[PDB]
Design a protein around this nucleic acid. Sequence first.
DNA 1: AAGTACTTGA
RNA 2: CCAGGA
DNA 3: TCAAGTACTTTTTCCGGTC
Lengths: 119, 30, 214, 203, 49, 56, 98, 56, 237, 56
Amino acid sequence: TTFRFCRDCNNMLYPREDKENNRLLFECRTCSYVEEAGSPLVYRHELITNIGETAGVVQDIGSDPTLPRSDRECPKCHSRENVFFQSQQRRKDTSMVLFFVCLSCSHIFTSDQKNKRTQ
Amino acid sequence: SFNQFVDYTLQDIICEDSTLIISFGKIYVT
Amino acid sequence: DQENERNISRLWRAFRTVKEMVKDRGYFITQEEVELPLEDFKAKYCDSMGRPQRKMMSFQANPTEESISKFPDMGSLWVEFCDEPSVGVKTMKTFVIHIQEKNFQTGIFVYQNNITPSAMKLVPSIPPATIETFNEAALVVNITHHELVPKHIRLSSDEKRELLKRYRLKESQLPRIQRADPVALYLGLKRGEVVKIIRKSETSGRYASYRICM
Amino acid sequence: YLEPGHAADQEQAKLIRSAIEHTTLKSVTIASEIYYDPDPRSTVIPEDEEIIQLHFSLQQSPWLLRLELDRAAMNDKDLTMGQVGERIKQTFKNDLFVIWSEDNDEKLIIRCRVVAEEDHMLKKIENTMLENITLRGVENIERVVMMKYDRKVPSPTGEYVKEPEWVLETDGVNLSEVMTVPGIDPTRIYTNSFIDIMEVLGI
Amino acid sequence: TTFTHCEIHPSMILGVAASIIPFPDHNQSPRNTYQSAMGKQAMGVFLTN
Amino acid sequence: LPHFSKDDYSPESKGFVENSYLRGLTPQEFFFHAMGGREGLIDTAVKTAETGYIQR
Amino acid sequence: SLMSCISVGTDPMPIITFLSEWGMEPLEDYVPHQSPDATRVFVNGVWHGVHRNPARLMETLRTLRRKGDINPEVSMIRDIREKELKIFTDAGRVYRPL
Amino acid sequence: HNGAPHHAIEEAESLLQFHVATYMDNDIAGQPQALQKSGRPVKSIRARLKGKEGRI
Amino acid sequence: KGSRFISTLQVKLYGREGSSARTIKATLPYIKQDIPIVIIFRALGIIPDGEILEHICYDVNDWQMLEMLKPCVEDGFVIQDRETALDFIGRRGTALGIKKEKRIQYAKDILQKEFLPHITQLEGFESRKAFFLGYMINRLLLCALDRKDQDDRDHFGKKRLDLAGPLLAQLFKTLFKKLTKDIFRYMQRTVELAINAKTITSGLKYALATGNWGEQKKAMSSRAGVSQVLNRYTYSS
Amino acid sequence: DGPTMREITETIAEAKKKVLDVTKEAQANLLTAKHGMTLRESFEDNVVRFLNEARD
DNA sequence: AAGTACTTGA
RNA sequence: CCAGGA
DNA sequence: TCAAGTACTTTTTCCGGTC
Ligand SMILES: [Zn+2]
Ligand SMILES: [Zn+2]
């Protein structure tokens, strides 16, 4: 989604349709502000989420002693130095796929041999 | 636990909401 | 074709069970009459589109020679179906007076979805004759046929009198079948009426229990 | 328990499993989206461009409800885009205009439009859709497992012989309804909830 | 290779009563739980005074 | 336990007591057996009154 | 257990005074989107502010304890993933020596 | 019998109602527990017959 | 230490997983109803949405959590300034405490003295208590978005053991305050040195003998078995 | 027996690998859940089953 | 911890 | 109540 | 009128001390 606020109010924006020119706007319900929409998408639900998997990957991730290490060669820098964890999306369903974070290039690679990622 | 109470805690209890129109100063334990 | 044929199967399955219940109650219905196939049901009670014509289905039934021996005052029965999913005071007043004029003893009304509280108020309006309401959906499956459902047999006034005499009982002391009980409904039991349940026993092979109506 | 004949037929078991195990529009949906697509004939989403080009050839709201279904999920609980779409169409009747991407097509999509003030209206329609629209199955009946129970039965020769059968195991109860289902033995059907047995089969 | 700390002695996970149980690593879990209840009722010199 | 790495689904991590009583238990085996052992003592304790009232 | 002890309860101020002096931006002046990766610092469930390089702060605080300057019964934890640093001067906490 | 102050009457009445109430049952919904001068509540007659330990 | 206001703040996510209009309201000490989070921030001084949202969600990217805040913004849309927010809080009593000047003055006191009493009970600390409430809403939503696990109510790290010292502390405080109000009684009587030292002694004496940790021969609910006779069967015992 | 103890140790040893094998299989997302079960639920069932098969 | 019985808002 | 026993 | 909330009810085997 990614929504905007009113400059002047800082209050949130409500969508208004410009019936005449068939176009979407964003009105402020505290002042007389109006701005045209960036995207046609107003609301996104998302039931089968993937946002949470690689959360809290601070560059300090290597400083956690609790995290386990592996000798897996990186897809980028080919470094056999990396820390690993499972999908941080705390759901029942969730697969046991592993996320490896490079102790040099910091690139996040997975063990998923069914699908190919970029997060 | 008891030592921390006598030495400190006990004094603090003696003077927190204590003072009445009469104040309570330093505590002594025999 | 679609999912039309399935509502037919269900109405036919329901009809078989109605016929089953009627024969069971103690009325003259044949086995070939019950065992009527689906194809034969279609080519009888379906219009010029194969849509079920429930008005045609409605039928009269008479007590078996055997039934008048046990229950002499057991009169004729009328079983009416309805093509209107919601049955109202208009269609009900028709059926109600029909039973009073044809001097019927009992009358069953098989309805698709509902019977308005307006129409339901005409149910106990014409005694000594009695009216019963059966939701078509319940009857799709004959519960009596189930593994766990044993033979219930309705006792006569004399048979009851004898039971109580033989066991030195007050009606209080007998185990009770609830008036609304699926089987008490299937048999059209009235308050005071007694059933004789014959169950199989891992103990004795055959065990006879009795239940009085609520 | 299955119908007398089709007792060893695993494919018959699956058929009933499918006909009884409850399925909602929610269980198949990846995500729902609300877009402002003002031309009913032409779409701002270039993906969908092809779906319109057909579900038009061989008046309505400019606000679009677009939901993506999961192919993997649409399969385990056997379903077609056609049959899913049909349920929505048959739920909202002539007050919702539905189009859907083909079972073949890469992404699985259902485009919906209504017949001043419409934003909140569609958010209600999507809640009705996910929570109230029943696709397959019977209510209260979830997780249906297939089971190969062993049954002792007399053989033609007389002796009692092991003749195992396919049996279904529910995660919920609805006696009245599952009994009236074609393909089962309504004479054999059992529930651990005796309160139900009492209510349906007598005391 | 990440080790931040080391255990002084693993036997220290035990309380006063369980610490008199000889080879508690060779007993079934509750038999140990039983002894750390019975020894409290065992006679002996409680204090020299 | 703090003696293990995160996301360890190994038998040794999730309570598999590899050893015989004759051989002896490792501290980890000992504590896990203790957790499992405590569960039975809890039901023995509870069941006792629940079971009593059922009887009544 | 034999080596278990229970925290007597110390004073939080020497630590709050120490923190501010060691790169701790006070909550009163926090601007979430400016410093968005900021490690949030708590002392007895009281959010005092944020810190930009916790790595170095955590090491300083640990050296402070291991020296005696920060009392040894004081608990300090750094959950890297959650971006949090919670400190406990608090009484009643059960501890063991390692 | 005397100069009825009419409110001091409905007052003295409601107190008697309470005593004759709390005598038979002291463990009533509307909380005042007719506590003996010792904090300890007064033992009602109902309490005496109430299950396991006590009469029946 | 100091009175110990056992006021527990609940931040409630109304609506279930699959219900429309999932609002966030919070039950404030001495206020009958649960106030929609927004009004609380407004009563605190954080007036425009987005300034409010900044305190809750820390990542401007995270659309998922932000959509979840839109209903709250709609719920608090009625109240637009700090004053009208305090009145709305003041309206919902208490009892009600009828009078416009009275209710707005109340809400001030509740937010200062009963709302989040740790942190500070002082005046000018709205900024601190706002960011905290926002940290709480962040955690409420983080769990509802299935990113964090529900809190383990049985984690030993989240438990404390009150030994002899804190136990005595609780009881001594109770009695010294009872002495303070007996000091006030003899000062009121003196319309112009009679401080009963018995209350402190006999009080501690009662508690430690009976093990009924409270005041005094009129104990219940008091916690019996706090103080007990030392087992001297064997040394280990 | 000395060799029975070698034979026992090597029974656990092979079951320990069988478990790692299902773990590696699950981490590589190749595991296919049993109808009416989590991918994880299905895995734990297998692990638990091998380890018991082993103890016995 | 799980009920009956009664009361309250849509 | 408190502590214990099968 | 009918779901959902409210009050208020109810139990838990047998056998010294210190008060
Ligand atoms: Zn504005
Ligand atoms: Zn790399």
